[PDB]
RNA sequence: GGAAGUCGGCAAAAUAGAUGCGUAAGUUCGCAAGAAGCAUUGGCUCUGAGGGCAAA
RNA sequence: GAUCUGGUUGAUUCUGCCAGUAGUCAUAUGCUUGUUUCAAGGACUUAGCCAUGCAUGCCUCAGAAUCACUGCAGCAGGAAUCUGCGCAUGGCUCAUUAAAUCAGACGUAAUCUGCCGCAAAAAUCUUGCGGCCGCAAAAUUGGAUAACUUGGCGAAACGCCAAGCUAAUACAUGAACCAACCGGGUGUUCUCCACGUGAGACGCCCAGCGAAUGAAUGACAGUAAAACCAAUGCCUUGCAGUAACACCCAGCAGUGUUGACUCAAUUCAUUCCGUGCGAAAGCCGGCUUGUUCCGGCGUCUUUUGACGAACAACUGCCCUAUCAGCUGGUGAUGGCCGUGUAGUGGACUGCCAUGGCGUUGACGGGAGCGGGGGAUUAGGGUUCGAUUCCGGAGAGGGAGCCUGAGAAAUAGCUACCACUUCUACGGAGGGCAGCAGGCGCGCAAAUUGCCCAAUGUCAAAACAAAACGAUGAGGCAGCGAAAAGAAAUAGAGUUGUUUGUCAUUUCAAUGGGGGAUAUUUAAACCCAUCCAAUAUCGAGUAACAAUUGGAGGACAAGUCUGGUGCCAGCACCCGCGGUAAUUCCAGCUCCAAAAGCGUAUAUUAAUGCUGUUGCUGUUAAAGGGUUCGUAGUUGAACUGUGGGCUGUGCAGGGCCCUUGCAGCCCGUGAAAAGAAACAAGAAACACGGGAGUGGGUCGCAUGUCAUGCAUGCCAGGGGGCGUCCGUGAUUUUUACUGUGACUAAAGAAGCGUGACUAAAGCAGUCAUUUGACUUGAAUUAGAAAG
RNA sequence: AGUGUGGAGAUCGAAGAUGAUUAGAAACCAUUGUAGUCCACACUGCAAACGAUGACACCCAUGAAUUGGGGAU
């Protein structure tokens, strides 16, 4: 009551619940990127739909339109920093051609797996959720963290993690404590 | 209580307004003064904002003005002789604005004698026009050479009572001021008063 | 008689967050209107950051440590609107309340012999008892004997220390004005024409330094000088020049990049 | 407006005819608004004449305008 | 108290003048209808309104 | 993502509904639930009823303490009680309600307005002394009455007498001179002057703000010269020259404002009777310590402007005609004179006169608080809005009222009607649509919690100091799978049994959780941080063990195996079950979503099945039997190729034509001027009170009793301008379209910004510093009317 | 078709009667017959009142006809 904190939704379910082709493609994506459920794919779908709707509205307007200029520059910038679009292509019609894998590549789990800090995409999610990966000296625990191209270089193991400058984990800590108990 | 709102009034279409609120103090009315001719009696009324309205229940004297002479005098009210609303307001001697009354013409006669040196009563405590210094006599001729009085007014002053019209609202101001009838206004009302007597 | 003012209903220029509280300090009646004022509590807490909360703001204000127009004010609900000189002698603050190009309130730092000067737009002229010509300004002042050439709309230069008028600037074509209300609030331009509509609102057309024409109702203009160069008061950083939004965005991005 | 009725004493009824745009159908519809106006004896308007009216204080329970000129 | 009287309200009681308002089913559209109902009314002292006839 | 599918036939192509399908901060209900973040939460039904508690009070240096209070030794705290102010806000609910309310846009020149801003104020014969007078003057004003005391009454009662104290910034009273300017009326008043528009003293009667009545101002702005007479100024002894004005003021307003005023203000006449007007006859400080010390306060009246109030209405706003007439005795529409009101008004009285409204839907009925906004939607739309912000209304129901700046107030009063509570029977009470909480009612909705730490409000009030103002407003927690965001339930291998599987075998990691030097917090609580810094616990069936719906079709996924046999059942729909059930009841297996997943009922999409976009009517539903015919809707043309020049185009068939350039009394006529075309945004007049001293185009005249300390100092003309007034066109609008103004937030777009991401939020950032960024907080859109 | 009031009443003929046919057969079929049918005036306004196709306007291929009015040989 008398609270003005805003909240909205980020995903939307498909119109047809059971399509063989859609289910097969979504299972492809889930297995390829190690996703807990289809709701992550649907969230990416909603982000893509919003971006493409904005791009269509801007492309309807004439080129000299100040609104088109400002918002197209903003969307170009956002795509380029977040890595969805290659820097070579700078037209407003390349946002319309974006696909779900383009954003799914930018997730911190996929980025860690590709960079080699993890042996698999299911290993990368565990590594992130277990406070082992730090992006630019900041521990990131969210697998869906979309990585900027400038922050791609700074991804490494956390200084507080055992796979780094931190103290030994539970397996070793508990074994050492048991050895002390025996001695 | 009494209200001055348009909620109780029928619409121009003839429909009945459906009132969905209680009466307000900002739309109230109050009972009329019904001021009579008698010894002075008033009652204060606390109006909106803290101010006061002097509801006069009776009045006997007042400030009546000779407009063509740009003067005023406090005289007694002798009668009320005509009301445009109804003759019941004349029978009951009700003093309201724009009502015709008869007042005391002695102060006006005295001022005329003192100002212009003309005694209306002479040709037919009182001021003596022959006592004046001859500097004042030169004053009188300067005033007398521009001004002429009406025979209708002069006849009334000689008779002792002159008709007048109330220009103040007694139920609001608490006083009965007025003006002397002159010109076509006097001839208009004199004709109405002659119809009654015949 | 309303005493409260919700934060949502409060003016946006106060910059009060919607999640901090339910209420905002309702401006007491005074010099400036409720919608066109900046309360002293807001000035001392949300702008100068001298007070961390309303309690400390009250401790500062009730001591008379904050002077508005050379007079100490103990009320945190004091209007304290446009053209007002606010001085804290203990910290030597001495700033004037103006409008910037975005329309928000700005604290333009002043000096000596400038904090003594305040401009007032004559909003009414009437003859008081004794046949005394009185001019009423935009801040509620009643000048008992103004310049004989004073007319409604012209501005007068007031010495707050000596409480006397020192100059009069007439509202004529070619004068430099600042827009006080509307969409063009805070912009500075020169009068090029004033379309007069008897019975309705007059429309003043203005042109700024860059040559951009813009119009506004004649009640929203405030004369501040005889020319766009010879202003009688110091203005905020932007000098009343509205910048194109795209150019401003690119300039801010370039500055942010250059910082790192 | 245009004079619609002149049967009262020192009072006339004027009609303001306009078209109202219905958004859904993208089309207009004709509507009118009758107004009670006080006509000074300085004017002698006939039914169908075209008049200019200016707003004044309530002079009766329906009159809020005064005739300023007959065209 | 109120038809418990009596074959049965028989007999009695009841109602009521004028004026204003108001009035149902049904109906051959004429009625029903004074339907049913409400209200007013005196005495005084006033004030309006409703005309003739003569006169340039 | 502008998307369809199953059911009518032996099959076919249609129409057409039914059924499926996706959402809903959209409610209920079932089953299920590890972590964290953000949230709505007795509107629906009964504007039903309510036990109990608590929600509005307030004191500084600065109104009034002899608590027979306290400390200290008078001083300082001070109960109480007067006094002032608030309590008309906030909170709640949505019952009423369609010329209402509300929204955008306007008014109030028709009004009221405490607080607060900036101002203003020369009315007033008072006081003390002696005998009305005399004399003097830092005016040394007077009655109350609480608390208190005494005696009390009453079963009680936010019930009460009576008598004794005693104060105020309470109440009443009252201040001459100092101390101005300015006007009006007069005297059988004197002094002159002339033989009265004379002049000058002097006397006395009034001349403050606000109010009342009456007169007068509140300008002008469409013509030139002489005469004469009376008076009066000058020149001198006839009119150049001359602001006005018979001294003491030789310029002490000849000039308010508006689009408009009967307005502001001024002057004159007469009036004001409590129903106005102190320097509170007030308080507190400094100093230097003052019959003229200097602050800070407080208060009366007058005034305007901020905060408001009240009133009016330009456009808009659901369904219904099996609602067509509505209004008018006894106001209906208007007029006249009043009355009432804060004001305007048929608001109202009297008297007139017949008006006013309606098929462009009046009147009546039904459903509704109205917006901002929400859901859903390619677009157009459709639906929702009890509910956070704004506006209205109400406090069981009606009505009336008092106080006050403001109430027709309800944690005010009065009375009725419902209900109620106590009683010692005489009496006395009540009002949760505030908060918590009952009881009903229902499908349906939390704690009789903590705190003012923040955000505000009121107040006599900074904070602190013997010395912490209230506040269920508000915040905080509890409850809370309404809703929203992030996220677990394992990861890497070995060996055997291309891969993969399965059985082994490892190996680390990390939570849930358990704690804390602590951190957070008003305090808690969450979060975050950590499990040594010398010194800190913990997974292996990682038992710390995921659920809810399904597998004939629509619709993803079993000719599996048992039961059952038109039974039990299931099945939205089509259907399955009558014994070798793809459909029931089970097992196993597989499918879909997943800390969720079913069901019911709405509503949006689907649905071009409401069709403006964009429907259909030969035979599927559906052209009226036919003509006439008013509303209403729709409606044929026509005032109209401008030319020339120079360049320049796959120009094309001197000509035509592209692009650009410069011309054109830019048809013909007529010649800067005139003429012609135009031009009301024009012309013709005329206004210094017209233009910041009448716009472009240092001494020397004035005069000098003048801060005349001022004025001229190009002349003239002709034009051209500003403003303002007057007078003239046998006068042109509106829709559309292009711009511009005006126009709350929240919400919706959108810019920027790694709150660890995100839903969020408007923050922050960066040097490392006593600070930068002169940090940011961009921009949009938002009907209709104006 | 029906209604009202006058006429008319040849023919055919709802109702009715009789004869057949039939399991039944006041159905079809025979023989009759009232109201009607016809007219005047007044009602009614219910048709497969159909082209199951509203009205006005524009454009629109071919060959053979037909009705009315013109014009030419
Ligand atoms: K809560
Ligand atoms: K009986
Ligand atoms: K009967
Ligand atoms: K009190
Ligand atoms: K009137
Ligand atoms: K009872
Ligand atoms: K409650
Ligand atoms: K259809
Ligand atoms: K027609
Ligand atoms: K026959
Ligand atoms: Mg009488
Ligand atoms: Mg009886
Ligand atoms: Mg018996
Ligand atoms: Mg009996
Ligand atoms: Mg009998
Ligand atoms: Mg009847
Ligand atoms: Mg069929
Ligand atoms: Mg309220
Ligand atoms: Mg109203
Ligand atoms: Mg409701
Ligand atoms: Mg109320
Ligand atoms: Mg109740
Ligand atoms: Mg009440
Ligand atoms: Mg209550
Ligand atoms: Mg009550
Ligand atoms: Mg588990
Ligand atoms: Mg279903
Ligand atoms: Mg059909
Ligand atoms: Mg927003
Ligand atoms: Mg038989
Ligand atoms: Mg028929
Ligand atoms: Na009379
Ligand atoms: Na009767
Ligand atoms: Na359905
Ligand atoms: Na509200
Ligand atoms: Na047979
Ligand atoms: Na037979």
From Swiss-Prot, chain B:
GO terms for molecular function: structural constituent of ribosome. It comes from the Eukaryota. Coiled coil: none annotated. GO terms for cellular component: cytoplasm; cytosolic small ribosomal subunit; nucleolus. NCBIfam families: eS8. Keywords: Ribonucleoprotein, Ribosomal protein. The keyword Transcription regulation does not apply. PANTHER family: 40S RIBOSOMAL PROTEIN S8. The gene is RPS8A. GO terms for biological process: maturation of SSU-rRNA from tricistronic rRNA transcript (SSU-rRNA, 5.8S rRNA, LSU-rRNA); translation. PROSITE patterns: RIBOSOMAL_S8E (PS01193). It holds the Pfam family Ribosomal_S8e. Belongs to the eukaryotic ribosomal protein eS8 family. The keyword Ribosomal protein applies. InterPro entries: Ribosomal_eS8, Ribosomal_eS8_CS, Ribosomal_protein_eS8_euk, Ribosomal_Se8/biogenesis_NSA2. This is Small ribosomal subunit protein eS8. Gene3D superfamilies: 3.10.290.70, Ribosomal protein S8e, subdomain.
């Amino acid at each position: 009551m008398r609270n003005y904190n805003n909240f909205n939704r980020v995903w939307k379910a498909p119109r047809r619940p059971f399509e063989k082709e859609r289910l097969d493609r979504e299972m492809k994506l889930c297995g390829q990127y190690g996703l807990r459920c289809k709701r992550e794919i649907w969230r990416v779908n909603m982000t893509l739909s919003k971006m493409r709707r904005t791009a269509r509205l801007l492309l309807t307007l004439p080129e000299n339109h100040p609104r088109r200029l400002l918002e197209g520059s903003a969307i170009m910038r956002r795509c380029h920093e977040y890595g969805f679009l290659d820097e070579e292509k700078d037209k407003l019609d390349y946002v319309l051609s974006l696909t779900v894998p383009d954003i799914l590549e930018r997730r911190l789990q996929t980025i860690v797996f590709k960079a080699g800090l993890a042996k698999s995409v299911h290993h990368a999610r565990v590594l992130i959720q277990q406070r082992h990966i730090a992006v630019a000296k900041q521990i990131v625990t969210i697998p869906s963290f979309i990585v900027r191209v400038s922050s791609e270089r700074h991804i490494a193991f956390a200084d507080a993690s055992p796979f780094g400058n931190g103290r030994t984990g539970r397996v070793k800590r508990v074994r050492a404590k048991a050895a002390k108990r025996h001695a | 209580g009494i209200v001055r709102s348009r909620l109780h009034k029928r619409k121009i279409t003839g429909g009945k307004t459906k009132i969905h609120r209680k009466r307000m103090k900002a739309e109230l009315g109050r009972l009329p003064a019904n001021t009579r001719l008698g010894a002075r009696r008033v009652s204060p009324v606390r109006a909106r904002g803290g101010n006061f309205k002097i509801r006069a229940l009776r009045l006997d004297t007042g400030n009546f003005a000779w407009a063509s002479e740009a003067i005023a005098h406090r005289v007694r009210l002798l009668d009320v002789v005509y009301n445009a609303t109804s003759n019941e307001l004349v029978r009951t001697k009700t003093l309201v604005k724009n009502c015709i009354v008869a007042v005391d013409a002695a102060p006006f006669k005295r001022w005329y004698a003192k100002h212009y040196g003309i005694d209306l009563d002479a040709d037919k405590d009182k001021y003596d026009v022959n006592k004046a210094s001859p500097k004042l006599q030169r004053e009188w001729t300067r005033r007398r050479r521009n001004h002429r009085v009406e025979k209708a007014i002069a006849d009334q002053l000689r008779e002792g009572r002159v008709l007048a019209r109330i220009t103040s609202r007694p139920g609001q101001s608490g006083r009965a001021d007025g003006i002397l009838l002159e010109g076509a206004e006097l001839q208009f009302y004199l004709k109405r008063l002659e119809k009654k007597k015949k | 008689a309303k005493k409260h003012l919700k934060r949502l209903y409060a003016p946006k220029d106060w910059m009060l967050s919607k999640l901090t509280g339910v209420f905002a300090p309702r401006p007491r009646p005074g010099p400036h209107k409720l919608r066109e004022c900046l309360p002293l509590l807001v000035i001392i807490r949300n702008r100068l950051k001298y007070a961390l909360n309303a309690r400390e703001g009250e401790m500062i204000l009730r001591q008379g440590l904050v002077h508005v127009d050379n007079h100490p004010r103990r009320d945190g609900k004091y209007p304290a609107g446009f053209m007002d000189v606010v001085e804290i002698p203990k910290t030597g603050d001495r700033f004037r309340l103006m409008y910037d190009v975005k329309g928000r309130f700005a604290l333009v730092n002043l000096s000596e012999a400038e904090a003594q000067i305040k401009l007032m737009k004559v909003v009414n002229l009437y003859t008081a008892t004794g046949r005394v010509p009185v001019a009423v300004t935009h801040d509620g002042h009643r000048i008992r004997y103004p310049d004989p050439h004073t007319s409604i709309g012209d501005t007068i230069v007031y010495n707050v220390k000596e409480k006397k008028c020192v100059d009069l600037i007439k509202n004529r074509q070619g004068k430099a004005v600042i827009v006080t209300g509307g969409a063009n609030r805070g912009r500075i331009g020169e009068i090029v024409k004033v379309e007069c509509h008897p019975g309705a609102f007059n429309i003043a057309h203005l042109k700024d330094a860059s040559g951009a024409e813009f119009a506004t109702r004649a009640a929203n203009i405030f004369v501040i000088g005889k020319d766009l160069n010879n202003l009688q008061v110091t203005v905020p950083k932007q000098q009343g020049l509205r910048m194109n939004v795209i150019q401003e965005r690119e300039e801010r991005l370039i500055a942010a990049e250059a910082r790192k | 407006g245009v004079v619609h009725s002149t049967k009262m004493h020192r009072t006339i009824i004027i009609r303001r005819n306009y078209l109202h745009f219905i958004k859904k159908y993208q089309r207009y519809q004709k509507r009118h608004k009758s107004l009670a106006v006080h006509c000074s004896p300085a004017f002698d308007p006939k039914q169908g004449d075209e008049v200019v009216i200016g707003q004044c204080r309530p002079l009766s329970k329906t009159i809020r305008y005064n005739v300023l000129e007959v065209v």
